[PDB]
Each structure stands twice: as structure tokens, then as C-alpha cells.
Amino acid sequence: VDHIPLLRSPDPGDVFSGVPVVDLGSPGAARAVVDACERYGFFKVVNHGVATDTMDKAESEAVRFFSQTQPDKDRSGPAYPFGYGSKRIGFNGDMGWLEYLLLALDDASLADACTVPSCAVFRAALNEYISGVRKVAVRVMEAMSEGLGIAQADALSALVTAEGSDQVFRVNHYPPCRALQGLGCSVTGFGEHTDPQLVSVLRSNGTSGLQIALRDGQWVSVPSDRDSFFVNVGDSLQVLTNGRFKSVKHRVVANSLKSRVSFIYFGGPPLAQRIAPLPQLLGEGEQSLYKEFTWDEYKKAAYKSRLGDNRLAQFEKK
Amino acid sequence: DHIPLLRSPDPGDVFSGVPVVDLGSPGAARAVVDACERYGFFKVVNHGVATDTMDKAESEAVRFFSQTQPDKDRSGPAYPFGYGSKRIGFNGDMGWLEYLLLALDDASLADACTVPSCAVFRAALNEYISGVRKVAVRVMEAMSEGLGIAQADALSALVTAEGSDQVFRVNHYPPCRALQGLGCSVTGFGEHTDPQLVSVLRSNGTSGLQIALRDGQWVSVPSDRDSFFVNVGDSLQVLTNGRFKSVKHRVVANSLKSRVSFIYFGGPPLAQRIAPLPQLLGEGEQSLYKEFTWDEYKKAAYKSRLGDNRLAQFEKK
Amino acid sequence: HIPLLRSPDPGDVFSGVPVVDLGSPGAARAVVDACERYGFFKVVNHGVATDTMDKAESEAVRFFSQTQPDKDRSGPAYPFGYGSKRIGFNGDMGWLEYLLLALDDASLADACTVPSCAVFRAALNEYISGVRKVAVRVMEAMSEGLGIAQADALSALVTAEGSDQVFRVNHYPPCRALQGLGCSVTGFGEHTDPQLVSVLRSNGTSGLQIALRDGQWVSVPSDRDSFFVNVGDSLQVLTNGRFKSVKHRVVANSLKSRVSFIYFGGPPLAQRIAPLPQLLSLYKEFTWDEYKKAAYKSRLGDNRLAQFEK
Amino acid sequence: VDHIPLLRSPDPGDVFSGVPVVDLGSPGAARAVVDACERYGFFKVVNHGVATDTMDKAESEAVRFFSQTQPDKDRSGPAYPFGYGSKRIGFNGDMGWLEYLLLALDDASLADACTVPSCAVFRAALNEYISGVRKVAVRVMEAMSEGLGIAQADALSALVTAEGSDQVFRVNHYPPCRALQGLGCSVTGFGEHTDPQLVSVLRSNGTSGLQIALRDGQWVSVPSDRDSFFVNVGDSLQVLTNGRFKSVKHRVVANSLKSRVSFIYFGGPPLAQRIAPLPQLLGEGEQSLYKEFTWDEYKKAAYKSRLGDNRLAQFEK
Ligand SMILES: C=C1C[C@]23C[C@H]1CC[C@H]2[C@@]12CC[C@H](O)[C@@](C)(C(=O)O1)[C@H]2[C@@H]3C(=O)O
Ligand SMILES: C=C1C[C@]23C[C@H]1CC[C@H]2[C@@]12CC[C@H](O)[C@@](C)(C(=O)O1)[C@H]2[C@@H]3C(=O)O
Ligand SMILES: C=C1C[C@]23C[C@H]1CC[C@H]2[C@@]12CC[C@H](O)[C@@](C)(C(=O)O1)[C@H]2[C@@H]3C(=O)O
Ligand SMILES: C=C1C[C@]23C[C@H]1CC[C@H]2[C@@]12CC[C@H](O)[C@@](C)(C(=O)O1)[C@H]2[C@@H]3C(=O)O
Ligand SMILES: C=C1C[C@]23C[C@H]1CC[C@H]2[C@@]12CC[C@H](O)[C@@](C)(C(=O)O1)[C@H]2[C@@H]3C(=O)O
Ligand SMILES: C=C1C[C@]23C[C@H]1CC[C@H]2[C@@]12CC[C@H](O)[C@@](C)(C(=O)O1)[C@H]2[C@@H]3C(=O)O
Ligand SMILES: O=C(O)CCC(=O)C(=O)O
Ligand SMILES: O=C(O)CCC(=O)C(=O)O
Ligand SMILES: O=C(O)CCC(=O)C(=O)O
Ligand SMILES: O=C(O)CCC(=O)C(=O)O
């Protein structure tokens, strides 16, 4: 369904030093979160308390899995409802220079229904990491509701701690494209998009590749940092804040010399959840910018769409 | 990769013992229980769905499938809903078919299921759907009656509950001109049992449907565009601790005429625990099955190949 | 895709292929009768030793036994070499793999570097020498049977220097998908051969079929000890339509492996091709180079002889 | 291979400014030709006596043919032994971003057996151009011999004017690649190779694309010049000069914005011709670097190879 798109190779003039940095354990974190979410939809989290040991072991097990042979990996595929995938992203023809694991959580662990990966050592290293990253996600969302003045402390966080939360966990591997070294153009690792749910929390190895789109349309590279997290505002959080936090549009450009390995936690609510601006955030007679929908509805619409589509616009008011 | 071939079926394979259930008769409950215990399959006559409703749904489907392939492909692919061609599920199964896979709310097309977009086709489907869903409820009440369950809705409540996972599928098996008169036929839909509770099929007059009898022989079901054919699915085999056996069935494409099929699949809500109804568990009787939710069964189903024995991994030692 | 075919039913085995005993009087009359009535005949008592056929076969069996990666090194098949499934240039396909090889006189051309194995090349070359002698004797028998005093009137076209002779080794492996289904896969789709004659030998496996004049398709029983000879289009023209070229095809055997050797006797490229003077034209003037290049612009099943008819 | 390789988009620093230029109507031509053939294997030819008019009409008629629809073009397909081709180059998987005509020549014009193209106007325009460029090839080969100090003035030119010489004529079309505008990388129009014959003579429209490898391996861009010819030493001329003239390795980098149309005459000898150093160029005792072979052998070994292969190596001692 067409090939992987090419992109102009990123400059070093494209690097972005202004990514906001949030010390979760700290005073003024709640305000730094709000500010970053308002102007970028994206920020780095440090001193998050997830051990570098568990991050390193999750990565090592992932690298081991992806180093298997293509037929051995294909036994865990395809990626839907869960499992291993190669190049194809979603259902509608998108492709990237990547391979990945798309996995399902129950609360703070892999779901037992999600039988990939089968190797107990990989599964156990993933589960320790997932526990850690899920607590960071909850803390980020409490810092959100706090910096937004929400008395209810779990106003956001409770949507992913609820029973039957739709929480997704994805391991991406962008191998090197050696065919393109020095040629001025680079292959898309993961085409541009916004994430559909509340928040995503990413951790990578040290290889570059992640880019975000600024408000003025410009694409900038985010320097990688294997010991910190990067947090995305997703479309659903754009709606719960009535447009105050805009979803960050982001993509991955594959490196032509080093493998890039990423772990991403996606916080989504239960399927039945009605997604609308939090009553607490609407002023007197303020109108929602959005039609009413449920998460199940948004998610299904999402899977009928292309990666780069503006999925929110179909649910915006006219 | 490629669509399997099969021995063309000849009149020697026709099966005359398909149980008949007269849905308006008070003997339906006993016929249904008997058929579910012997074949997992039965025809349903005198069902109250008008032939004009069936005709107009079929006519609108045929028109959709007559569209060019680029035009159909715009309603594709088939997941989470929509149009599909040849590929069945996610794991390489293929058949000489195209189809629509549609989602329901209660007894109509779900608003979120945007396919088909054409309001005439949608209206005809919604009329047919309303009728067949009523047939399925009646069938399931007859089953519970014939099983001796006090609660009349012991089964039917599972597809009428809020958040029911009910699927509606339109299958088109077109002619295969190339195989005309060659002694072999292309697979229309590979062999499988259905995962949920009950399936209710109606087709146009074309042959193709086959079922496997308990001894494994494949026999052809005579088509009847005016009746329904009901399948026991894996989840109902579990609710009856093995009493009702899921029917294995397939479609062999006809090399001469289109076969157009409508199928309603009755599933429960995703969170339903699937286990032997406690009413059907004698004294000390042990369930043959591990406990599981419909969500779990369905997720494991989509990880499997069409012909896999999906129940096997949920059976006890 | 590879076209499927109705499986051949024993009903259509043809027992009446003419038999030409090459060491018997009246070989000449039998040869000519079969070239007129069928375009096709069996050749027995031909002098090629059983031993030289079996060694050609087993070395070819050995070659096809290699891995697909190793066989692909000798491919694809043009201007010579190994091919798989694709026949010609215009999308024809069959369930087969093969070697198409070029001959210098009665041997594999040194320029034809496939196959590389010396053992295999030896067996082929000894086989090729035998069958080419059989081809010459067969063409000499046709001139005798036509009342032509020059007994090399046909033979000379393939003994000339620069004669264009091709040799192919076909392998039709089993098709397990189809066993006992009543439909068989095409091993090699219907065609007439463009040259003067072709001389075929196979192992015992069924699969060769010819079209009778009608033309119903009938199965020819295999016979590993004998050759089967086709009239090709060029020989139809050299006889102004008296021998019509046989239309033939191969239907792969779903259980069995069929291995074939075919020599194709063509003239030199410069050869002007017309009814032999001794036998007098329905055909336009053309050279073998012309017919060959036009043949390669066509599909297997095309009537290549029409665009050269009046 | 199945992908068309990409290459760095050529910058202005890659522009070769010193392509050798040969005034064909000049007495110094012969010295300039030998120097260029030894040092670059490539030179430009000006003041060549082919009318701008002749070139324009062949070009417009080729543009007309290529603007035909794909189904209509494909009926002159495929390209072997003669005809139309798209993307695929030769037999062994090479691909470029182009379509083309591969045509056979007889004497000074299109061979009648090469039925493509059908349109007598195209054919007529092509034959006028072909007559012009073949005479340029003959004059070039005459200047080569004069400059080697060979007495017999047709010692090279006679191999292509001879009866049954294997001359080939190719019309290449490199359409734009809009998908890559501004991305810094370009798509391969025609992969690197040397030509197997004696000489090749090329003329294009004004769109860039042609690049050659210098002796030190650097790839440089050749400025396009729609009114001049560019001449390549081929592998066979390397053998007839005993290694003195080295065949130029070259390629085309498709322009992403504009269409590039090319004609190329390939001067080869008759198939039976023994290819070896010209007697005159071996001083007593001097050893030929090459096994003995015939054009037919070299040409067939060439078609068994891949485009970038060093075809000359297997025929070295
Ligand atoms: C075409 C796609 C691919 C989607 C769904 C749809 C649009 C949005 C994409 C993502 C983007 C974010 C998450 O990785 C994901 C798992 C998610 O939730 O949305 C993606 C999902 C997928 O890759 O399968
Ligand atoms: C068992 C399931 C669950 C499916 C459908 C079927 C197989 C594929 C699954 C997904 C996976 C991707 C999307 O979330 C989804 C909405 C989709 O489109 O496909 C899923 C859908 C569901 O969870 O309801
Ligand atoms: C390989 C497949 C194809 C499945 C899923 C999985 C196993 C069972 C199949 C069916 C069988 C019955 C229904 O048609 C269906 C919609 C259903 O519910 O189960 C099918 C579903 C699909 O086509 O998407
Ligand atoms: C479509 C094809 C395939 C041709 C060329 C063209 C038409 C005639 C075919 C044969 C038919 C007979 C010989 O096998 C053959 C080697 C031959 O000489 O002619 C074939 C050749 C080829 O396979 O390369
Ligand atoms: C080096 C050669 C020799 C070719 C062209 C090119 C590659 C393919 C060869 C053939 C092979 C098949 C036909 O005989 C032919 C006439 C044809 O069409 O292709 C051949 C042609 C030739 O011998 O003149
Ligand atoms: C891979 C290829 C493509 C070849 C044959 C083989 C090796 C050399 C190539 C050229 C290169 C020069 C001419 O364009 C050509 C027509 C020629 O004479 O040789 C090419 C030929 C072809 O395209 O058919
Ligand atoms: O893998 C990465 O580094 C980011 C990819 C991404 O944004 C996603 O998978 O939604
Ligand atoms: O389409 C038909 O006729 C029956 C196919 C079937 O049984 C199914 O899709 O589950
Ligand atoms: O004997 C065989 O199987 C091949 C006969 C044939 O049809 C051919 O390839 O020309
Ligand atoms: O087509 C061009 O412009 C040059 C390509 C070339 O040299 C060739 O096709 O051999």
C-alpha cells in the first residue's frame, strides 16, 4: 500500500533545546506541566523515580527479541489485536521503517490475554518497567489537574486507573537504514500524527529520531535522553481541557546508522467513558468546542483513519 | 498466500436431514434442543420476517457489490468495520469472497459504524437487522425453554443486554468463471466454528454452504432463500457444558452464480464470564472448560487461524 | 497466475500415436503418414543407449535437487540458463522449472556456460549427440518418404554451420495442493513449436498431451525408452502445409515428478524459409531470424504462423 | 532487486567543467579524441553536421509516443528482442525511473523486422536522426584511428558499417519524480554501467541527468547540451585498443522536476566478429590483455550479467 515516505534529513539547525523539563518530585512541577502542555503539548520528565536498572533490562530484552530472525519474530505477529508488527502501521496503508510490539495492559501489568511476548524473562522485564511508567503517568496527570486548579486530585488520573481502562503499551524498533547514509534524505520511522488518548509517556535509548511540530508548523528534533521520559498531550486530553492543551504532532525519522528503541505507554480511559471538557474547567456559560463522543467511538474512528489525519476535526463543533 | 481448492460438491453430498424448527409452533423448544444436541445446526421456518424485507436487503447488497472495486475499496478495509475482499481475519486466511463486516447497537446498525454510507442501503439493512435479531431472541428463548430453564431469557438476555457484542456480516461469493467445468471449486469461506453464542444466516438461492456431521463427513445444505439457518457457536457449547456442539461449516463457491449471505452473530458483552449455566450443572458435575470472558475468547479468536479449534485451549485437562 | 486445467481422465488416453521403427523398412512411409495425420509420432529402435539417457536424467535430477538460491545463480533463462515458472517474455507461466541451452553442432556451445558442473555437461553432451543423430535420421526419413532425391534436403538445415538448435530440460515437480481434486495445474501451456522438428524424451511420468485435428485434447502415454517427435511451424512451411505442426501442452502430475529433454532443430538465422522447391506457396517470404524474433514477441498459445500467411 | 536505488541529489560542486570537447570538422579532432578516450572514455562532439531540425523532430515524435497511455505503450512491449519497456533494465532485476524504446538497426536505419514503433511519422523522424548520428559515429571512429597512427582509415569504422553489424538504438524517457522534490535525494534513472559495444553516441534534451565516473571514482555531472553529442568508449573498444581507451562508467540521475529524453546509438560489430587488439597497435611481442572472444559471446555474457557488473573482467587474462 505505497512505500515508506521519505523526508528531508534533519539538520542540526533543527535541534530544539527549549523542550520544557519537569521535575515531578518538586515544587512548581504542576505549574511547569500546565505551561508546557499549553505551548507545546509535550515535555520531558526527570527525577521520576523509575530505576535505570529496570529501564536498561527492558531495553536489553527488547533488543534481544528484535535481533531474532524475521521468521522467528513473525510467529508473534501480526500486531492486532496484539503482537508483533513490521512496517505496517494501522489498517489503512501507513508504513514506516520500523518493527514493533503492540501490547495490552490490565491495570499496571501486561494483560494475561496479551500472550506476546511469550518468553517469561522479557515479560517480567516489561512488567517491571510498565509498573514504573504507569505510576509516572498517574503523577503527571495529578500534576495536570493540580496546575489547572482542580480540587479533585484524581480528576484526570482516575480515567486510566479505572477498571477497564484502555491502556496500550508499544515497543518500537527503528533499525538503521544503511542504504540512505549521506544521501540527504531520510526514511520515515513513524509518520506524523497526534496520539488519540489522554497521555503518552515515551522512553527511548540514546539514538535520535523523535521530532515534534511547533505551533508555527516547523518540525524540530528532540534530543534523546535514555534516562528521562517524554510526555505527549493526546487528543482526548485536548478535549477534556476544551482546547487549552493542544495535542502534540510528532513523528520519528529513522537514523541511518544506529537502532532506535522506544517504549511508549498510552493512557486511555475505559471504552464507555464520555469524553468532554471537565465541568470544572468550563467557565460560566462556556461552550464545548467538541461534539459529544465516547472513547470507544473515537478509537474506532481513529482506526478507520490515516496516521496523519486530523482525527479531532470530525468531532469539532461547526 | 492463495485460496485453497476443494473437490467440487456433487449431488451425492446433499443432506436431507437438516432439522426444521417451526418458530411459531409450541414444539419448537424440543426440536431446537434436539437439533443443537445432534448437529449444532437447524433451519428455522415460519419466522415472521417478511420476504420483502429480505429481498430489499439482498437487492441493496447486490448493488453495492456491483460497484467498481475502487469504489468498494473506499469503504474498506473491514476492521474495525467496513468492506473486505478475499482476506478473512488477520492471519492469512483467504476465500473467494468480498464482504461487509458491520457493528450493531441493540437491533440496528451502530451510528459509529459508518459503512455503508448510502442511506437507502442502510435503511434496508436496518429493517432486515431488526427482523433477524427478533428471530435470534425467539430461537434463544426456545433453547432455554427446551432445556428446562425457568428464566425465559437465560440466553436471550445475553444478546439484548447493553453493550452486546453483536456482529452483522454480508458475504458475496461471486462466480469463478475460470473454474467453470474443471472438476474443482474454490473455497468461499474456509471451515470454522463460530465463536459466539448463535449465528443466524439467510442466503439467496445459491448453493455453497456445507456443514460437518459428527463423523466428520462434509454434506451440502440445500439453500432456501426464505428460511434461516442457525449455528450453535463455541460460547453456547460452553454455556451447556458440552451438550450443544458448535457446528463446523464452510462455504464452497459456485463457479456459475453469486451467493449472497446475511449473517447475524449473537455475542454477549465483552465482560460476560462464559461458563456452564449453573442450571445445567447436575450434582457435582464439573465444567469441561476453563473460566473466561467473551473479550478473552474473542481476542484469542482473532489471534487464531479460521480453522483452528479455538475451544481446545479453553478446555480443562 | 498459472492456469488450471481439468484433470486428464483415463478416458482420453490416445493409443494411436504412430510408431516409427527407425531400423525397419518403410520407416519413411510411416514417418510421412504420421506427419500428415497428427504432426506427431513415436520413434523406437533409435540407437541411443538406455545408459546415456539415465545419466543425463540423473544429473538433471541432481541439478534440480539443489536449493532455489543455488539454482537461481544460473538464471534467469535468457539468452540461456535456468528458469522457473515464467515461459517466454509475455507473461506465460507454468508449473515447471527448466534449463534452456544453446548448441554448437552436436554439443553444448562453449558460450553456453550453464550448466557449470563438468559431470552434468558431459552427460548432456553425450545425450545431445545421440538425439541429434536421431533428429537427422528422422529428417532423412521424411525426405525419402516425400520422394526427394536429395536425402539431406531437410537434414542440411540443422547440420549447416550456424544452425540455430536449442535444447531444454523441463522439470514438472509435484503439486501437492491439488492431489486428488479433479483439477490439475498447467505444466506448460498449449503451443506449436516454431522450428522444423523437436525430439522429446521423458521419464515415465504422464503429462504430455496433443490436440488432434478436431481438435480434442488427448493424453500420450509416456515411454522413457523412446522419443516423440513434433512437426514444428517451419516444417509446415517447408512442406507448404502438408505437415501441420502439432499443438501440444503438458499437464503437471500432482503426485509425480516429470523430467523431459527436448531438442529443437532449427536452421541458421539467415535461412530463407519457404516451401521446398521439390514439393510444388501459402506463406509470405521470411527468414528464421524473422520468425524467431516475431515468436518471442508473442504469447505461447498464439498462432504464430498466421502473421506469415497470405 | 525490486526497489529503484536512490542517490544523493547532485549539487553544483559536482558539475564537471572540463568535459573534453571535440570539433569534428577540425584537424586536431583526432588528437583530442585519443586524449579524451584515454583519460575520460568520454567526450562531447560539436560542429557535427546533424541539423537541430532533425533532432527536434525525432524528439517531438518520441514525446508523442510516450504521452500515449500506458495500455497503448504496453502493446509495443515488452522490450526484448525489440520494443517498449518501463523501469526494468535487462534480465537480472535492474530497475530505473524511466521508460524506453529498444530498437534494432539495419544498415543506416531502422530494421524492418523491428516492427516498433508502428507510426510511419515516428519511424521517418527516427530514420533521419539515425542516419545523422551513425555518420557521426563513423567520423568519430575515423578520428580515433587517425590519432592512434593507424594507416587504414576505416580500421575502426568498418566494424559498424559492415554488413550484419549489430547496431542498437535506444530512446530513453526519464519522467519527473514529483514525490522527491526538495528532499535532497534523487532516484536512479539508469544505473551505473559501461557500454559493451565499441562506441555509443548520445543526444538529449536540455534536462540534466547524465553523470560519469572519473578515473579516481568520483561521480560528476555532465552539463546537458541539446545541440551536441556525447560519446562513450565501450568495452569492445577497450579490447581493440589493448586497454589504452578505457570504457566510461556512467549513469543517469533522474531530475525530479523535468522530463529528460535521450537518444543513444550503440555501434557494435557483426556477431561473428572476433574482438581483439588491432594488429597495428601491438608492437612486436606486446601481449593482448584479453582472452579471445566474439561479439555474440560478449553480448550474451553481458545479458547474463547485472548492469553494474564489470563485464570485461571475465574476459581478462
Ligand atoms: C492508523 C492508526 C495507527 C494508530 C491508530 C490509527 C491512528 C492513530 C495510531 C496510533 C498512534 C499512537 C499509538 O501508537 C496507537 C496504538 C494509537 O492508539 O493511535 C497508534 C495506532 C496504531 O499504530 O495501531
Ligand atoms: C477482537 C477484536 C478487537 C478489535 C476487533 C477484533 C480484532 C481487532 C481488534 C482491534 C484492534 C485495533 C482497534 O482498537 C480496534 C477497534 C480495531 O479496529 O481492531 C480493535 C477491536 C476492538 O478491540 O474492539
Ligand atoms: C480468522 C478469524 C476470522 C474470524 C475471526 C477469526 C476466527 C473466527 C472468525 C469468525 C467466524 C464467524 C464470523 O464471521 C466472524 C466475524 C467471527 O466472529 O468469527 C469471523 C471473524 C472475522 O472474519 O473477522
Ligand atoms: C512464448 C514463447 C516461449 C517460446 C518463445 C515464445 C513462443 C514459442 C515458445 C517456444 C516453444 C518451443 C520451445 O520450447 C521454445 C524454446 C521455442 O523455441 O519456442 C519456446 C520459447 C521459450 O520458451 O523460450
Ligand atoms: C544478446 C541477445 C540475443 C537475444 C537478444 C539479446 C538477449 C536475448 C536474446 C534472445 C533470446 C530469444 C530469441 O532468440 C531472441 C531473438 C530474443 O528475442 O531474445 C534472442 C536475441 C538474439 O539472439 O538475437
Ligand atoms: C543489464 C543489462 C542491460 C544491458 C544488457 C545488460 C548489460 C548491459 C546493458 C546495456 C548497456 C548499453 C545499452 O543501453 C544496452 C542496450 C546494451 O547494449 O548493454 C544495455 C542492455 C539492455 O538494456 O538491454
Ligand atoms: O517510537 C517512538 O520513538 C515514537 C513513536 C510514536 O509516536 C507512536 O508510536 O505513537
Ligand atoms: O456466507 C455464508 O454463506 C456463510 C459464511 C459463514 O459461515 C461465516 O462468515 O461465519
Ligand atoms: O515434455 C515436456 O514435459 C515438455 C514439452 C513442451 O511442451 C515444451 O516445453 O516445448
Ligand atoms: O539515457 C541517457 O540519457 C543515458 C543512459 C545510458 O547511457 C544508457 O541507457 O546506456
Residue numbers in the entry:
A (entry chain B): 10 to 327
B (entry chain C): 11 to 327
C (entry chain D): 12 to 291, 297 to 326
D (entry chain A): 10 to 326
Would you copy out the relevant sentences from the publication that reported this structure?
Here, we determined an X-ray crystal structure and performed functional analyses of two rice 2ODD family enzymes, OsGA2ox3 and OsDAO, which catabolize plant growth hormones GA4 and IAA, respectively. Both enzymes formed tetramers for OsGA2ox3, and dimers for OsDAO with the aid of their substrates, thereby enhancing their activity, as schematically summarized in Fig. 5c. With increasing substrate concentration, the enzyme gradually forms a multimer with the aid of the substrate itself (effecter), thereby resulting in an increase in enzymatic activity and in the active catabolism of GA or IAA to maintain hormonal homeostasis.
GA 2-oxidase 3 (GA2ox3) is a member of the 2-oxoglutarate (2OG)- and Fe (II)-dependent dioxygenase (2ODD) enzyme family that requires 2OG and molecular oxygen as co-substrates, and ferrous iron Fe(II) as a co-factor, to inactivate biologically active GA4. We crystallized the enzyme with the co-substrates, 2OG and GA4 in the absence Fe(II) to prevent its enzymatic action and determined its structure via X-ray crystallography at a resolution of 2.15 Å. The crystallized protein consisted of a homotetramer (see below), whose each subunits with a common core fold in 2ODD enzyme family. While GA4 interacted with non-conserved amino acids, such as Q206, Y312, Y89, Y109, and R179, among 2ODD enzymes (green characters in Fig. 2b and green closed triangle in Supplementary Fig. 3). Additionally, GA4 also interacted with 2OG located at the bottom of the active-site cavity. K313 in subunit A directly interacted with P87 and F91 in subunit D by a hydrogen bond, and vice versa.
